[PDB]
Ligand binder design. Structure first.
Ligand SMILES: CCCCCCCCCCCCO[C@@H]1O[C@H](CO)[C@@H](O[C@H]2O[C@H](CO)[C@@H](O)[C@H](O)[C@H]2O)[C@H](O)[C@H]1O
Ligand SMILES: CCCCCCCCCCCCO[C@@H]1O[C@H](CO)[C@@H](O[C@H]2O[C@H](CO)[C@@H](O)[C@H](O)[C@H]2O)[C@H](O)[C@H]1O
Ligand SMILES: CCCCCCCCCCCCO[C@@H]1O[C@H](CO)[C@@H](O[C@H]2O[C@H](CO)[C@@H](O)[C@H](O)[C@H]2O)[C@H](O)[C@H]1O
Ligand SMILES: CCCCCCCCCCCCO[C@@H]1O[C@H](CO)[C@@H](O[C@H]2O[C@H](CO)[C@@H](O)[C@H](O)[C@H]2O)[C@H](O)[C@H]1O
Ligand SMILES: CCCCCCCCCCCCO[C@@H]1O[C@H](CO)[C@@H](O[C@H]2O[C@H](CO)[C@@H](O)[C@H](O)[C@H]2O)[C@H](O)[C@H]1O
Ligand SMILES: CCCCCCCCCCCCO[C@H]1O[C@H](CO)[C@@H](O[C@H]2O[C@H](CO)[C@@H](O)[C@H](O)[C@H]2O)[C@H](O)[C@H]1O
Lengths: 1033, 156, 151, 100, 50, 50
């Protein structure tokens, strides 16, 4: 095939041009995101029961729904939380590869057939079934510096004037508002209600009656009396539109003539739908919009579009209203794409340089400058064809491939230049002979390399999804590389290279360049002499090899495995958690106290603190809070001292003594949730009808025994909440019947006033919005207030709650968990230093087996895909290993020569490991993929040395040693150029700091080190492998 | 609150015997309390941890401390069926006829949950069998409204 | 898609069905007409009747089998337990009461009401205590149902 | 309900949740004095109609509960549609023994 | 059918005393063995062909 | 403002993408002749006929 294009250079250009065009179009319409989607499809079912406790939500909503999630396809497991904030969240996780759309609709439908079974008020609130992406494109903060409006005002304005427009912005998928549009608010007064013999029941009734839509009909409506001249609609009663009208609602008429109005027994105001969350941006009331990227959309275009949309609607904001970007991944992504474009560019220059440093002409230096791009462009086109996107992973998959594409370019060219000199052959006939030497090997490298990489596209679970991003990118590039090397480069070489007279090695040339040649032709002789000398007694080296291999294993198992390097995404969190019963005001003090810390003792780095009072990943409540710290740009935070990791340690340290509660700080995961490499996700289960209390005992028991193995287990802890004091009110049925008081009047006067009640809707300036009834704060705070509420009895008398009730304190759960339909408790933890998560799990399994009868367990986090996708690595790489073998066996038509090549694997690994262990890094995804390219390049070098050696013996009849020496001599220059170009090209990644520097350091060191080791070692060891292997058989 | 009190309050909850013992050697205020007035003694009695009840009493615990609603450790113990604890508290001067804000007495709570053995013990230490709550109900009344004749019989 | 389309139309009729049909739950499944298998369950220590066993499989096994991928429908050969109130017309008349009263009483005395919190948001300034209010809760035993006050 | 009302309580509430749908070209809607409303969604020419219906329905679900009780009682259909009639089949009576 | 047994297995350990699973009707076993038999005849075929 | 829908929408799109349609199309013919006739001169000469 190379001969074919050697004679048809134009055709070669055509194929190149097409690849270039497709590639070009590819990067035009190709998706762009920080990360592809790797987590298994998930669907969440959210419901809200205002005023309800955890137990109430669970037993009337959670359980009901859970019991109807039958007949859905590919469900891995289902988990849920029922809490005292009145909400329930059921998460269903589906098998990877499941269509999320089908998954959602199948879930949504089963719900629809369970709705009649749910409490009425839960049915009015609604039940939301949504996809569980969990990744936001950015979040827009909306605050008011004028101090002219509350977060409820900011929210309303946001929902009615910004929400809709953002949703329609090109590329935006979903959008969450941080708060709610107004709600008509009726704040009742029990002292006023009693004064008129009224109850929250009378209130509600009047609202339902006086705030409604009433159908009427038409005048001259069909079927009419003939002769009818007009037909018109009859508009009757419509919904109220203002607080004034609501206050004007007639509640009662006394027989003296007076009129009792609603504004005469309650405060009427436009407020929030819920008050459990108070958000602030640098101490100012705040609101916002969580924005997610739409499928297959370009992240950069979307960020720009939502920006242009915001700018476009700015002229209509209220005084003091301005938006802010606490969270935005776009900048990161932009930086990432930039840094990747540099790396390839400079790598291309570096190749030019060394290519010119070793070679005489420019026509040569030019050839790779064409080949590499063509190969890169084409790779994009192939990814496009596989629906891949430009993201953090795919881009690095390409940088880790540079060496492989640079090598292919340098190899084909260098060999042609080497053939022309060692024999006066002209550019064309010389290119024909050159290819005839490597072309065979070239296909081998391809088959072998794919043997190494495609297997990696077969790991399962979210981890498998990551390996797949690198795998396909690399194999594709590599694949196109051999194609281009077999079609485009030969044509270019037999076309642009100038003749070079037999025996001219530049030794007889001008100044410097002439000196270099002289010295290189010199070092080549030394080098060949060392090998002859080394091949003069191999034993020494067989021994050194074992020392290496042995050192590799030791160095390996001591290297701490991990996921993806943490990063400084200019933002991080700080968790705040207070004691059981801690009020909303108390945690406000702390959050402010945290905010202040950040805006003061860190004024240099912190840009803003978004203090969310009332939320906490492992459980909502008044005693929980979180502050998202948005840092200044990277160019204002130089010095490790001013980085998330550092700032975090200093922050947690400083908060390490706030005596009111635990307030730690922390950087955030590279992707989604735990992912804790050393972490495991346990699930304790009630398999009999044990109950919360007995489950708790079992939990404690398991946790106590866990603390007795700090050698294997570390940080064993429950991911949920602890029980707290509850106010148990008992209604005496006999007494209520005796005084003539109905249980329904009792339960609504109670729950409405103290829990709140969603009555119906009203239109606010054109938008339907809820109407809520609830007691005024001061009358629903303490146990003594209970007695201040009255209920009208049949006989008309008013009776105080204290007449028919009695109470007492007790303990209960403010957050009941559940796994696969049964009561449960989640437990997180990690393997002790040195131990593997696998070992840590195995122990927890042994300790769990010693728990009370009826207590089961199960894994669910990263733990599910590890007890399942347990391990393929060996069974996968054993396959890779075997595959590589057959390929070589075919290339060399020998059942033994392959071993002389395979023996190089450790040569690069040791270097990567050395560099790794030294720089302190860890065994992560980048480090690993890097190990694969390094082995690949070294393997290539060997294949080409063995190919030449075996070649000379068979063709010239040269001896084992003579052939080997001759091959190694010929392969020295090319091999050196590639390593020199690659090591220098990868060098900028190794030193790089800040801004995606974690990933770059990872891909950098493991590669540079393994590269330095693989090269300096292979040129001296493969000759020994070939020779000792050939000696044996 | 107090520094170690918080720790002692949680200890009596989980029943961590050893920590409580260490906490005693350090003076963790046995009179600490959560927001509703539960004392380490209330908790331990509620959750049924006998040893910690015995330790707390050995270290000055108020055997008749009451919560915001007037309930005592004896109320809790009786109500949740911890016979051994019910005996210890009584043995140390727990008020057997103690009445919470509703007029409820340990005897009421025991009867309601049908804890016979505890009721007899309560009767033993002189519990008032005719005690009435805010609704006028006696342990007998509650006894028949529940349909517990064994209990109803002991109450004669 | 078929199941999806059929249910799309079914929710158009749902509102039009009697309250009691809706409350029993109408289902839509996609499965073969014949049985893949039949998992039987017995008691070797003759310590539980066919009623006890059926209730156990329905309360501890069916749900999870019904959620397994590939399982299109699960038929229980027995019935899950329910709180059974067997009325006596003679005694009802004796006390001048009808099943109407009885149904109304179970709805009023076997309730799970949401009653809010103490010191619940939005709170008054200075609030120190926040706790859930637990009022009526579901009944859990025959004894609890037995003592519902009719009149 | 009148046009303006239905558009306020139904049309707009549904429309706002019709975001995040793949291949959506445009959306149009009507709100009548007969209280009837209609929202049509057109997708890119090569879109799979069934998946489009599924996605629409998945979003319409978020809105169902925010609709008037009596609108839910009437049920809301999410169907694949076309604008013109293929044919119109007529029916008449030739022996005059049947009115319209 | 395999998924079902797996689930059934997570349950068995917690069954009440004497409670036991039995398998009265399964159309699965046939399928599996039936196929394995046809495989068997194949090995024989190669041997008889050999 | 305004916009074009339905029928008219297709019409706009139709005419708006016609230029690069003809452009990419000429390019593919040229490149094909080039390759097939291993020449830059031959294809350019024919393409002038368009
Ligand atoms: C379709 C069902 C199964 C078919 C799949 C086949 C998988 C391929 C396995 C072969 C892999 C061998 O890898 C490939 O081996 C072939 C020989 O066949 C080598 O072929 C080369 O070396 C031989 C050996 O001198 C030369 O004579 C020849 O000029 C050249 O083609 C390639 O350089 C190598 O890349
Ligand atoms: C830019 C790259 C060019 C660099 C080339 C120069 C590198 C020189 C460093 C030597 C590396 C290996 O070092 C090589 O060791 C072998 C032994 O194993 C020596 O070999 C010598 O000692 C061995 C005994 O060990 C004898 O069998 C042999 O007859 C003798 O010549 C070589 O003299 C030496 O060159
Ligand atoms: C030059 C010739 C090239 C050779 C090409 C030959 C094809 C290579 C195929 C090797 C198979 C490896 O691919 C492998 O598939 C098997 C089962 O199918 C899966 O194996 C699965 O079960 C194995 C054992 O049954 C378990 O350890 C584990 O549950 C899982 O690995 C592996 O997870 C997957 O990695
Ligand atoms: C000399 C070497 C020969 C190599 C020549 C290569 C020929 C390639 C022919 C591809 C033919 C594609 O025909 C098939 O129709 C689909 C349907 O949309 C087209 O797909 C295209 O149209 C869809 C509309 O559906 C657009 O949204 C989109 O721009 C694109 O995906 C693609 O064209 C392909 O999926
Ligand atoms: C054997 C050779 C292989 C055949 C190669 C096949 C390539 C076919 C290219 C498909 C392009 C179709 O996809 C289409 O992209 C073109 C641009 O090119 C867009 O249409 C427009 O793009 C450009 C913008 O650069 C406009 O100036 C131009 O008027 C028009 O072509 C369409 O909005 C999009 O749908
Ligand atoms: C060139 C040749 C082509 C390749 C052919 C490969 C075929 C390999 C299939 C053999 C694997 C299964 O072997 C098969 O034998 C078993 C017994 O020995 C069968 O088991 C059978 O054993 C008894 C023998 O009659 C029967 O009464 C039982 O009903 C049944 O259990 C299994 O159902 C099956 O496992």
């Amino acid at each position: 095939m190379p001969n074919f294009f050697i004679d048809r250079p134009i055709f070669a250009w055509v194929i190149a041009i097409i690849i270039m065009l497709a590639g070009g179009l590819a990067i035009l319409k190709l998706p762009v995101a920080q990360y592809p989607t790797i987590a298994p499809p998930a669907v969440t079912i959210s419901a809200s029961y205002p005023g309800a406790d955890a137990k109430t939500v669970q037993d009337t909503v959670t359980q009901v729904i859970e019991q109807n999630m039958n007949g859905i396809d590919n469900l891995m497991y289902m988990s849920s939380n029922s809490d005292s904030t009145g909400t329930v969240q059921i998460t269903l996780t589906f098998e990877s590869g499941t269509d999320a759309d089908i998954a959602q609709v199948q879930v949504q439908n089963k719900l629809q057939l369970a709705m009649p079974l749910l409490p009425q008020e839960v049915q009015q609130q609604g039940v939301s079934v949504e996809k569980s992406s969990s990744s936001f494109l950015m979040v827009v903060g909306v605050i008011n510096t004028d101090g002219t409006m509350t977060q409820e005002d900011i929210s309303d304005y946001v929902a009615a004037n910004m929400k809709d427009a953002i949703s329609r912005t090109s590329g935006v998928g979903d959008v969450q508002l941080f708060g709610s549009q107004y709600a008509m608010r009726i704040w009742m007064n029990p002292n006023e209600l009693n004064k008129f013999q009224l109850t929250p029941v009378d209130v509600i009734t009047a609202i339902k009656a006086q705030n409604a839509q009433v159908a009427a009909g038409q005048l001259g409506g069909t079927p009419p009396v003939k002769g009818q001249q007009l037909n018109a609609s009859i508009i009757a009663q419509t919904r109220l539109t203002s607080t004034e009208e609501f206050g004007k609602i007639l509640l009662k008429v006394n027989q003296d003539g007076s009129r009792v109005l609603l504004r005469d027994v309650a405060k009427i105001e436009l407020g929030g739908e819920n008050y459990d969350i108070i958000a602030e941006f640098n101490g100012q009331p705040a609101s916002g919009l969580g924005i997610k990227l739409a499928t297959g959309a370009n992240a950069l275009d979307t960020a720009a579009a939502i920006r242009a949309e915001l700018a476009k609607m700015e002229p209509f904001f209220p005084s003091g209203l301005k938006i802010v970007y606490p969270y935005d991944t776009t900048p990161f992504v932009k930086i990432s794409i930039h840094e990747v474009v540099k790396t390839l560019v400079e790598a291309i220059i570096l190749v030019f340089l060394v290519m010119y440093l070793f070679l005489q002409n420019f026509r040569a230096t030019l050839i790779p400058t064409i080949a590499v791009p063509v190969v890169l462009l084409g790779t994009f086109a192939v990814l496009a064809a596989f629906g891949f996107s430009i993201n953090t992973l795919t881009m690095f998959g390409m940088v880790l491939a540079i060496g492989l594409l640079v090598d292919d370019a340098i190899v084909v060219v260098e060999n042609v230049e080497r053939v022309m000199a060692e024999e006066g052959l002209p550019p064309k006939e010389a290119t024909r002979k050159s290819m005839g030497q490597i072309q065979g090997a070239l296909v081998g490298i391809a088959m072998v390399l794919s043997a190494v990489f495609v297997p990696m596209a077969f790991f399962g679970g979210s981890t498998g999804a990551i390996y797949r991003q690198f795998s396909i990118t690399i194999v594709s590039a590599m694949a196109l590389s051999v194609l281009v090397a077999l079609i485009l480069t030969p044509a270019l070489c037999a076309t642009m290279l100038k003749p070079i007279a037999k025996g001219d090695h530049g030794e007889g040339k001008k100044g410097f360049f002439g000196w270099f040649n002289r010295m290189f032709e010199k070092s080549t002789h030394h080098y060949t002499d060392s090998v002859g000398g080394i091949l003069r007694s191999t034993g020494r080296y067989l021994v050194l090899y074992l020392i290496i291999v042995v050192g590799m294993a030791y160095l390996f198992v001591r290297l701490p495995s991990s996921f993806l390097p943490d990063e400084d995404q200019g933002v991080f969190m700080t968790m705040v958690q207070l004691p059981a019963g801690a009020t909303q005001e108390r945690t406000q003090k702390v959050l402010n106290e945290v905010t202040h810390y950040y805006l003061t003792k860190e004024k240099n780095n912190v840009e803003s603190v978004f203090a969310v009072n009332g939320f906490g990943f492992a459980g909502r409540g008044q005693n929980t809070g979180i502050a998202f710290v948005s840092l200044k740009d990277w160019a204002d935070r130089p010095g490790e001292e001013n980085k998330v990791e550092a700032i975090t340690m200093r922050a947690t340290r400083a908060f390490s003594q706030i005596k009111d509660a635990m307030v730690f700080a922390f950087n955030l995961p590279a992707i989604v949730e735990l992912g804790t490499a050393t972490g495991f996700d346990f699930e304790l289960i009630d398999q009999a009808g044990l109950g919360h209390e007995k489950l708790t005992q079992a939990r404690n028991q398991l946790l106590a025994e866990a603390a007795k193995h700090p050698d294997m287990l570390t940080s064993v802890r429950p991911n949920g909440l602890e029980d707290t004091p509850q106010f148990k009110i008992d209604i005496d049925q006999e007494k209520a019947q005796a005084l003539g008081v109905s249980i329904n009047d009792i339960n609504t006067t109670l729950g409405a006033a103290w829990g709140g009640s969603y009555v119906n809707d009203f239109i606010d300036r054109g938008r339907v919005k809820k109407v809520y009834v609830m007691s005024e704060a001061k009358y629903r705070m303490l146990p003594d207030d209970i007695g201040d509420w009255y209920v009208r009895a049949a006989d008309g008398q008013m009776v105080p709650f204290s007449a028919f009730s009695s109470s007492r304190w007790e303990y209960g759960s403010p957050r009941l968990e559940r796994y696969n339909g049964l009561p449960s408790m989640e437990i997180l933890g990690q393997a002790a230093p040195g131990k593997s998560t696998g070992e840590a799990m195995e122990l927890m399994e042994q300790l769990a087996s010693k728990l009370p009868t009826g207590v089961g367990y199960d894994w669910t986090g990263m733990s599910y895909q590890e007890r399942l996708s347990g391990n393929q690595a060996p069974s996968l790489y054993a396959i890779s290993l075997i595959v590589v073998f057959l390929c070589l066996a075919a290339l060399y038509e020998s059942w033994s020569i392959p071993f002389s090549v395979m023996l190089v694997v450790p040569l690069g690994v040791i270097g990567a490991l050395l560099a790794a262990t030294f720089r302190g890094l860890t065994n992560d995804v980048y480090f690993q993929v890097g190990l694969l390219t390094t082995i690949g390049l070294s393997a290539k070098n060997a294949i080409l040395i063995v190919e030449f050696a075996k070649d000379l013996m068979d063709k010239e009849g040269k001896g084992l040693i003579e052939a080997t020496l001759d091959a190694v001599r010929m392969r020295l220059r090319p091999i050196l150029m590639t390593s020199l170009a690659f090591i220098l090209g990868v060098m900028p990644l190794v030193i790089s700091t800040g801004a995606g520097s974690g990933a770059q350091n990872a891909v950098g060191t493991g590669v540079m080190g393994g590269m330095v080791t693989a090269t300096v070692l292979a040129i001296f060891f493969v000759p020994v492998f070939f020779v000792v292997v050939r000696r044996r058989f | 609150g107090s520094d170690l009190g918080k720790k002692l309050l949680e200890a009596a909850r989980a029943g961590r015997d050893d920590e409580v013992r260490i906490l005693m050697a350090n003076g963790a205020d046995v009179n600490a309390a959560d927001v509703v007035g539960w004392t380490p003694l209330h908790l331990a009695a509620y959750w049924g941890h006998l040893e910690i009840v015995e330790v707390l009493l050995k270290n000055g615990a108020d055997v008749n401390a009451y919560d915001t609603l007037g309930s005592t450790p004896l109320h809790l113990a009786a109500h949740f069926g911890h016979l051994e604890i019910v005996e210890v508290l009584l043995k140390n001067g727990a008020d057997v006829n103690a009445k919470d804000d509703n007029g409820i007495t340990p005897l009421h709570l025991a009867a309601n949950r049908g804890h016979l053995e505890i009721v007899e013990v309560l009767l033993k230490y002189g519990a008032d069998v005719n005690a009435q709550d805010k609704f006028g109900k006696t342990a007998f009344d509650i006894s028949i409204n529940n349909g517990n004749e064994d209990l109803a019989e002991i109450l004669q």
